[PDB]
């Protein structure tokens, strides 16, 4: 009478809680779509939550739809405000907002994400464009250098000799180490409210391929050889623009399409164009920072302990156990343990008595990592035999 218990119908979202994986968590830093707080990062769960917060049409809204339809697990969005309009002015207030010291108080006091991404620098293609591109990268490459474990996801402009002049620009070695560019911008299958297709940056498709091939295969594998789901084609192929093959700038990653298989990510190699330093190869930078994230989790468990020799060996025994299990899981190179990793805490091994009295506890880890199979050098031998 008072109540009628029965079967209803509604489209509310139940949601899911905590996907962890802080190292491969993307962070989208576009402008708010036209009641989230103007600065705090917002946990976006499924694609239903991305529409219930941010609508369906925009620039950040299509990048979230292209994130979860490429196999993304969870994303965070850092809003910035209801931007102006006249998009040559939104896109120099975007860079000016990212240079504020209030960006550092939100990225350093975050500890939930690990892939910095601004997908709205793709709008610079419409639009000095070169000046805006270089202080678009270099602002992102310093927010990650400063932060303990963040990786930038960058992109090149479509026009060659504007993407050539960006790679032939000065970036310090410390900064290159942590950030990557994928060149060909993606033509999606989303309508633009008319017959014409929506062209998005490749980077929401990349950040979904990074954290699903780190969830499925492990973060040590590679982010490449991944079929991009809901893309028609990359807007430009490498057979029509032989620029960017000039070996005089930062390493770039190519997104291509094949015949028997679709649009593939076809590279994993950081902005370091150095042949011997193993801080190229994205999965090397993301594996060793996934070991930073856990070994510093059990290090600060033994933090406000005495500096006596028992607590040094309580810490080696826990780190040696964990590193041996990851070697037997396939994460490190080496057919014996002596060439896979090493630990060396001690009083006259790493520390000294002056280091102990200042309250330090210094532990050394050496690692041996795996190399990709980027080139297959087939040979044929006849072997006559009568």
């Amino acid at each position: 009478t008072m109540v009628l218990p029965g079967v209803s119908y509604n489209e509310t979202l139940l949601t899911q809680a905590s996907n962890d994986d802080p190292v491969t968590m993307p962070l989208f830093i576009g402008y708010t779509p036209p009641p989230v707080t103007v600065m705090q990062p917002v946990s976006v769960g499924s694609l239903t939550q991305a529409n219930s917060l941010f609508g369906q049409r925009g620039t950040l809204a299509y990048s979230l739809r292209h994130f979860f339809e490429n196999g993304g697990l969870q994303c965070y969005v850092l809003p910035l405000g209801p931007g102006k309009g006249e998009p040559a002015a939104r896109l120099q207030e975007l860079i000016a907002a990212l240079q504020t010291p209030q960006m550092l108080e939100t990225l350093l006091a975050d500890d939930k994400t690990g892939l910095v991404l601004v997908p709205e620098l793709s709008e610079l293609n419409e639009v000095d464009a070169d000046a805006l591109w270089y202080q678009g990268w270099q602002v992102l490459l310093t927010l990650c250098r400063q932060a303990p474990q963040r990786f930038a996801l960058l992109e090149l402009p479509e026009d060659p000799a504007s993407a050539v002049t960006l790679t032939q620009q000065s970036f310090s070695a410390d900064q290159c180490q942590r950030g990557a560019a994928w060149w060909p911008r993606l033509e999606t299958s989303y309508q633009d409210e008319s017959s014409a297709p929506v062209v998005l940056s490749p980077l929401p498709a990349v950040a979904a391929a990074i954290q699903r091939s780190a969830h499925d295969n492990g973060v040590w594998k590679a982010p490449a050889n991944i079929a991009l789901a809901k893309t028609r084609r990359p807007t430009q192929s490498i057979l029509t623009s032989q620029a960017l093959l000039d070996n005089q700038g930062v390493s770039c990653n190519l997104i291509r399409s094949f015949v028997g298989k679709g649009v593939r990510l076809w590279g994993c190699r950081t902005l370091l164009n150095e042949e011997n330093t193993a801080w190229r190869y994205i999965q090397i930078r993301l594996l060793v920072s996934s070991v930073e994230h856990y070994l510093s989790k059990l290090a600060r468990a033994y933090l406000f302990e005495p500096n006596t020799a028992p607590t040094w060996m309580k810490l080696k025994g826990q780190v040696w156990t964990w590193l041996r299990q990851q070697w037997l899981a396939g994460a490190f190179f080496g057919t014996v343990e002596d060439e896979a990793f090493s630990l060396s805490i001690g009083l006259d091994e790493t520390m000294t008595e002056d280091d102990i009295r200042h309250g330090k506890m210094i532990l050394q880890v050496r690692l041996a990592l795996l190399a990709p199979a980027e080139f297959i050098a087939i040979s044929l031998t006849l072997d006559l035999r009568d």
Binding site: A301, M313, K314, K316, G317, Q318, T321, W322
Partner: protein
């Protein structure tokens, strides 16, 4: 030659994933860690005088621990959860001997130890003894360290 190691000073460190702090618990009677390789004998046709032993599979022993009935530690509260089947969490155990000063001379470093047995001591009216309870763990791997191997 350097002096051999005596067997009456030892620390044990536990690290569970339920419990946020690593805790250190004093025991009375750590039993002893074995490690067998499990060979098998093959007999060949024409050979009657030598033997042939073929290596198969490394078998690890069990960590049997003894301590008195004292106040509730984070490890007897953890065996209570596992033996009530409320969790199946296991821990990384570090056992180490100590020399005259404080220094760890050998370290045994067990991995994924699972609490499997609780055993209470006897209640006897004329006894004059501390109530000792016996704890027992099965681990997956074992890795001995230190300078006195």
């Amino acid at each position: 030659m350097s002096t051999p190691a005596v067997s009456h000073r030892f620390l044990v460190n536990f690290l569970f994933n339920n419990i946020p702090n690593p805790f250190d618990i004093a025991f009375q009677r750590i039993s002893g860690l074995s490690r067998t390789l499990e060979v098998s004998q093959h007999r060949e046709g024409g050979e009657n005088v030598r033997n042939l032993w073929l290596a198969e599979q490394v078998n690890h022993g069990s960590l049997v621990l003894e301590r008195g009935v004292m106040n509730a530690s984070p490890l007897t509260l953890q065996f209570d959860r596992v033996l009530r089947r409320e969790s199946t969490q296991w821990a990384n155990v570090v056992i180490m001997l100590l020399n005259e000063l404080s220094l760890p001379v050998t370290t045994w470093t067990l991995s994924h130890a699972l609490p499997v047995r609780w055993q209470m001591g006897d209640l006897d009216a004329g006894s004059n003894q501390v109530l000792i309870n016996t704890l027992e763990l099965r681990y997956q791997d074992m890795r001995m360290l230190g300078v006195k191997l």
